[PDB]
Amino acid sequence: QSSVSWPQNGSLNSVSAPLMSYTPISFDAKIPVASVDKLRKDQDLILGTLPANSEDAGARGLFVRANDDGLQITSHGELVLDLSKRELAQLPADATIAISATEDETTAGIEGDDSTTETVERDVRPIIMGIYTELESNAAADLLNAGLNAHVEINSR
Amino acid sequence: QSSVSWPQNGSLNSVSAPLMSYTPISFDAKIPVASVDKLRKDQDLILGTLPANSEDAGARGLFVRANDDGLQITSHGELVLDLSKRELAQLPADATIAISATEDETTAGIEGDDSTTETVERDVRPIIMGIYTELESNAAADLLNAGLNAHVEINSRFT
Ligand SMILES: [Zn+2]
Ligand SMILES: [Zn+2]
Ligand SMILES: [Zn+2]
Ligand SMILES: [Zn+2]
Ligand SMILES: [Zn+2]
Numbered sequence: 667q668s669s670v671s672w673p674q675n676g677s678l679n680s681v682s683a684p685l686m687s688y689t690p691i692s693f694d695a696k697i698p699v700a701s702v703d704k705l706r707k708d709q710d711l712i713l714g715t716l717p718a719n720s721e722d723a724g725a726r727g728l729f730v731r732a733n734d735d736g737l738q739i740t741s742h743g744e745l746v747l748d749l750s751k752r753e754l755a756q757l758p759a760d761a762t763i764a765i766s767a768t769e770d771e772t773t774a775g776i777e778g779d780d781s782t783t784e785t786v787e788r789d790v791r792p793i794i795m796g797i798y799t800e801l802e803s804n805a806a807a808d809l810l811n812a813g814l815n816a817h818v819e820i821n822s823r
Numbered sequence: 824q825s826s827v828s829w830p831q832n833g834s835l836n837s838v839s840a841p842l843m844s845y846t847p848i849s850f851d852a853k854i855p856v857a858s859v860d861k862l863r864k865d866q867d868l869i870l871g872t873l874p875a876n877s878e879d880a881g882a883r884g885l886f887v888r889a890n891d892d893g894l895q896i897t898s899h900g901e902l903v904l905d906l907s908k909r910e911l912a913q914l915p916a917d918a919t920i921a922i923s924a925t926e927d928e929t930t931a932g933i934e935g936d937d938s939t940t941e942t943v944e945r946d947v948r949p950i951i952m953g954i955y956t957e958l959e960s961n962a963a964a965d966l967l968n969a970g971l972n973a974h975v976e977i978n979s980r981f982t
Contacts, residue, residue, distance in 0.1 A: 667850065667976055667977065667978060667979070668976075668977045668979055669906075669974070669976055669977070670954075670974070670975040670977070671972065671973070671974050671975075672954040672974075673963065673966075673967060673971060673972070674974070676959075676963055676967065677963055678956055678958045678959075678960060678962060678963045678966065678974070680953060680954060680955040680956055681953050682952065683842060683951055683952065683953045683954065683975060684842060684843050684952075685842035685845055685977055685979055686979070686982060687979060688979040689917070689979065689980045690844055691824070691980045691981055691982070692979065693836065706934040714876050715836075745832045750905060762852050769982070770954035794840065795838060795839060795840070795841075796827075796837065796838045796839035796840040796841075797827075797829040797838050797915065798837040799835060799836075799837055801835050802835070803834075803835055803836070804835060805835060806830065806833050807833065809835065810830065810833060814939055815828070815829070815830075816828070816829040817826070817827075817828055817829075818826065819824060819825070819829045819838065820824065820825045820827075820842055820981055821824050821981035821982060822824060822825055822827075822842065822844065822845045822846060822950075822981070823844040823845070
């Protein structure tokens with residue numbers, strides 16, 4: 667639950683009352699393997715659902731990070747997929763990671779074969795406030811052509 | 824049900840995606856009856872939950888209105904409380920309208936006087952984007968001191 671009151675600050679001014687964060691019905695993303703090399707320097711965030719300095723952010727949001735140990739995807743604190751550097755450099759240049767987070771399960775794997783996919787068999791849907799990234803701005807065109815995408819569905823009642 | 828997609832434009836920039844409108848767990852309000860005396864010229868809205876130019880706002884929101892014909896409170900197009908301006912005139916000067924919108928029922932009445940309580944026994948909770956008003960600005964201290972208030976509890980986990 668979250669609360670909105672009115673009047674505010676001794677004033678009768680109309681106020682906006684948006685929901686700032688929520689657990690979605692579902693979240694899904696397609697992440698071209700190519701984005702790993704489109705990150706800004708000493709950055710690791712391909713995609714996040716909460717801003718960095720958010721409270722308990724890593725335990726609540728969904729995060730795709732790539733660094734020295736390879737790629738890591740967490741959702742609501744559960745590790746979803748884990749590829750070492752070894753595992754990464756072996757993936758075809760045109761590989762995509764498909765993420766799907768839903769009440770029943772969260773799965774992540776290479777859009778490709780099924781030997782690769784990783785399931786958490788439990789509800790671990792992230793908290794979301796938007797979509798955050800540390801990818802280079804100029805890389806938009808390459809990565810949109812490559813299939814970069816995130817999609818959140820929310821119920822409103 | 825709403826959607827959000829990313830990237831937006833042809834930009835990789837981060838985006839915030841707040842949920843703009845929803846149906847709350849509940850909405851409650853206390854509206855001093857002195858509020859009817861304190862509307863801006865030619866306006867009748869004491870409190871609404873959607874701005875006047877939302878599509879079907881009249882069908883979706885909750886509105887407390889006051890004009891020549893008295894006071895009406897509508898949510899989701901259902902008239903819960905009407906008070907003629909005669910009925911209004913016998914009320915004490917400190918009277919408060921109490922409203923409650925929950926999924927079980929929507930109640931509205933003169934607080935502390937359940938000879939006046941009106942209860943719509945369906946779920947008729949409003950859609951909410953905010954709290955809007957054409958109450959005069961200089962009325963803030965008078966109305967606040969009499970206990971003007973609206974309160975929305977929202978569920979953020981969605982099924
Ligand atoms: Zn949690
Ligand atoms: Zn495995
Ligand atoms: Zn209706
Ligand atoms: Zn009706
Ligand atoms: Zn309340």
